[PDB]
Structure formats: C-alpha cells, structure tokens
Amino acid sequence: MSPNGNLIRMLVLFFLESELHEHAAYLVDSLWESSQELLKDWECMTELLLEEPVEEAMSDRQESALIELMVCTIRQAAEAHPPVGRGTRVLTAKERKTQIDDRNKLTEHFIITLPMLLSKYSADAEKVANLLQIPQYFDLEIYSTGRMEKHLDALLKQIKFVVEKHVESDVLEACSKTYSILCSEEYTIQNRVDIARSQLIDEFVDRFNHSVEDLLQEEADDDDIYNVLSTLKRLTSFHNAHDLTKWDLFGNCYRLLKTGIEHGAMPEQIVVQALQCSHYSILWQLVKITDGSPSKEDLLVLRKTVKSFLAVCQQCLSNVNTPVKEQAFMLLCDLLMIFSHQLMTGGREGLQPLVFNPDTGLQSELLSFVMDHVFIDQEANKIEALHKRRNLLAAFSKLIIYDIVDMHAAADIFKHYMKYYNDYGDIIKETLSKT
C-alpha cells in the first residue's frame, strides 16, 4: 500500500539513475513475468501522483517517469503481449481471464482518476500527452455500465482545458486521438462526445476567423500573428482524424497563403500550418466524393480547389524559409500521387475530371528542391533531419516510378550525386574490408 509505494518510487529511481534500461516499455516488459502484481498496482501509482507528501516529495523528473512507466504497465496489461520490438502470441485460459479482469480494473480506475491526473498536471505538455495515451486502453462500454457519465463529462472538461492551454503538436494530437476514440467506439457515449467536440471546434473556428480577419485587415501585430498561428495549430491537429469540412477552413487558409506569396511576409509557421490544414480539408473533400455518388459539378468544384492548392504549394517552394519548402514539397509529392491516374482504380473511372499531370515548370521545380534540399553538403537533430530528407526523397521516388516527373532527368541527378560511389566505391569497399 505504502510498501508498494516505496517499491514503485525506487523502480522509478533505478529507471532514471541507471542507463541499464533506455526504454520504460522494455524495463516494464522485462519485469512483467516477476512483478505483474506490483506493476498493476494503479491505485498506488495514481496515489503517488495525486497525493501531497508528509517526509520527501517527488521531483518533476520522477513524476514524469512514474507517469511514463504507469502508461507502459496499462498498455502491457490491456494488450497482454510484450511491446513493439520485444514480440515473437496464444494466451492460456488464465492469461485471457487475467487480461479481461485487468482491462476492467484499469478502465474503472482511470475513468475516475485520469480527469484528476489531467487537472493537476494540466500545464506540463509532456505529462499530458502521456496521460492522454490511456483512454485507447479503456473498455469504453463501462462509461454507460457504471453510471459513470459524471467522469466522461470530467475527462471532456479536462481535454477542453488542455487544448485551450497548449499549442505543442504532441499535446494537440493526443487530444485529437482521444476525442476520436471516445466518439466512434460506443453509441451510448457517441452523442455526448460529439456535442463537446463540435462545441470545442466551434469556439476555435470563431477565434481563428476573427484572427484571420484581424491579421489581413492589418502594419501587423505580434498579437495578430500569435492569434492566427495558435488557433490554426489546434484546428490543423484535429483536421487529420476529424472531418472539419462543414467549417470552410480551406477558404481562410487560402487567403493567408495568397497574402504570404503576394506580400512575401507571412510568418513561416502560419504558412506551414495553413498548408497542412488545406491539405487535410482536400483529403476529406476527396473521401466524401469517393464514398458519395457525386455529380459533374461536385467533381469540377473539388478540381478547381485542388488546382488552386497545387498552384499555392508550387509558389511556396520559392518561400525563403526551408520549413515551408519541405511542407510544400511533401504535399506536392502526396497530391500528385493521389490525383494521378491511380485515382481511376476499383471501377472509379467517374473521377477522371479530378486527375492532374504536373506541367514542365512544376516537374523542374520538384527536381530543383531534390538537388537543393535532399542532397546537401552540410547531434540528435541530424539523425532526425536525415530521416526527413529520406522521406522527402522516398515521397519523390514514387513520382519517378510512375513517370509523373521526368524519370530520366531524375536518374541524371542520382548519377551526379552517386558518382564517387560509381567511380571509387569498389576501391573504398575492399580497402575498408582489410582493416
């Protein structure tokens, strides 16, 4: 009770203090067979996290590590298998019984305590993002079963406060996914969550629209910039998993971008976010048009939107800020692949009016960016910046394979940059073998 308290407090200390386990997930997994009883004492953990001390308090770093370990135990209990990259998966009657009982315990416990955890740690971006990994493991039918409506209201309150207080992409994405899970995965609670979600979106679209209007009518203030960026960030996060097309966000993103090209003075993050949001609008417009039975004018309206946006992304390759170029480049390489002839697979030849062939100018600009921003002369930031350039090339590779860009001009560039491997590689290879 307080015994298990010491053992957990020390488990959190051994984790942080030794570099004998890099990953909380792997520490939890390794101890799982020997210490399941302890590692599922969630009452003990939430008590450590929520109580005020008598003596000796927990540090921010140990609080963070307990939350990260707690969430790892919640996963392992619910999935009843080792974590990704310790796998090898057929449960006994008693493992299956233990899994169901564990899912019941952690659901009842965290429906009650997760709102309290979010309240207390509301301002800490890393902690909140970790805590919001918990609902995915809930047996959500229990929100009805337990007359537990009061606690669903409480989580929704706390997600609203979190979304309202934060702009970090991890927090916002955690919030987006938590609404997604609450809605479409039990009818009983669907209607209540939909109401809270659309009210949250409503308040954010209003503040966004008023801020767009402020920024563009305006001399332009650092307040004007913050208001546009901050609200657009929230809406961009949600627009991936939530269909926000009912709110015409593409229209205002389009003005922000047109303004940024014309007068060349739109802050980089507003352009990047505006590009992402516009993209998510278009992808959702496309899904409604596939699944529907769309008319001629339906198709020709989505086309005008998509051609106007392809134009914007092209112009944005010329933006001074490389984060804009990369965003514009990534979207060009997605959209040119989606609105390719592929779109007329699975008996969907109705969509022909939506098909796009990039002109010469665009193909050449998509070649330039590869030469200038994938293949560059010159810690942790650099393994990350390299995986990105890999993804940019890989995205662009797909266009080459299906002849959407000039596949010869592309390989000419791959020649140029591989030369030293094709000129000296064998000699370098065998040299390095004998050392």
Ligand X SMILES: Cc1c(C(=O)NCC2CCC2)cnn1C
Residue 425 contacts ligand X per CB under 6 A: yes
Residue 421 contacts ligand X per CB under 6 A: yes
Q: What region, left, alpha or beta, does residue 294 occupy, with left being phi > 0 and alpha being psi -120 to 50 degrees?
A: beta
Which residue, among 206, 196, 274, 276, has the nearest Cα to 240 in the 3D structure?
A: 276
Closest distance of CB 412 from ligand X, Å: 17
Closest distance of CB 429 from ligand X, Å: 7
Residue 415 contacts ligand X per CB under 6 A: no
**Measured distance CA(331)–CA(366) in Å, rounded:** 11
Closest distance of CB 408 from ligand X, Å: 21
Query: For ligand X, how many residues bind (rule: CB under 6 A)?
Result: 5
Nearer to ligand X, 353 or 425 (CB): 425
Residue 433 contacts ligand X per CB under 6 A: no
Contacting residues for 188 by C-beta, under 8 A, at least 6 apart? 141, 143, 144
Closest distance of CB 414 from ligand X, Å: 14
Nearer to ligand X, 248 or 412 (CB): 412
**What is the Cα 414 distance to its own chain's centre?**
32
Closest distance of CB 425 from ligand X, Å: 3
Closest distance of CB 34 from ligand X, Å: 50
DSSP H helices in 121-186? 125-131, 142-145, 149-165, 169-183
Nearer to ligand X, 287 or 428 (CB): 428
Residue 423 contacts ligand X per CB under 6 A: yes
- Which token pair is 404? 């959407």
Closest distance of CB 424 from ligand X, Å: 7
Name the DSSP letter for residue 372.
I
Contacting residues for 304 by C-beta, under 8 A, at least 6 apart? none
**Measured distance CA(257)–CA(234) in Å, rounded:** 18
Nearer to ligand X, 18 or 422 (CB): 422
Give the range of 28-36, 117-125, 194-202, 423-431 binding ligand X by CB under 6 A: 423-431
SS3 (DSSP) at 247: coil
Whether residue 182 contacts residue 193, with contact meaning beta carbons closer than 8 Å, is answered with yes
Give the range of 164-172, 293-301, 339-347, 415-423 binding ligand X by CB under 6 A: 415-423
Residue 14 contacts ligand X per CB under 6 A: no
Nearer to ligand X, 187 or 420 (CB): 420
Among 92, 217, 345, 422, the residue binding ligand X under the rule CB under 6 A is 422
Nearer to ligand X, 422 or 435 (CB): 422
Closest distance of CB 411 from ligand X, Å: 16
Name the DSSP letter for residue 6.
H
Nearer to ligand X, 150 or 429 (CB): 429
Nearer to ligand X, 3 or 425 (CB): 425
Give the range of 127-135, 338-346, 369-377, 422-430 binding ligand X by CB under 6 A: 422-430
Residue 431 contacts ligand X per CB under 6 A: no
**Measured distance CA(371)–CA(293) in Å, rounded:** 43
- Which token pair is 366? 């998509």
Burial of 3 (0-12, 13-18, 19+ CB in 10 A): exposed
Contacting residues for 9 by C-beta, under 8 A, at least 6 apart? 48, 58, 62
**Measured distance CA(194)–CA(198) in Å, rounded:** 6
Residue 394 phi, psi dihedral angles, 5° rounding: -65, -45
Give the range of 89-97, 347-355, 372-380, 419-427 binding ligand X by CB under 6 A: 419-427
Give the range of 61-69, 122-130, 278-286, 421-429 binding ligand X by CB under 6 A: 421-429
Site residues, ligand X (CB under 6 A): 421-423, 425-426
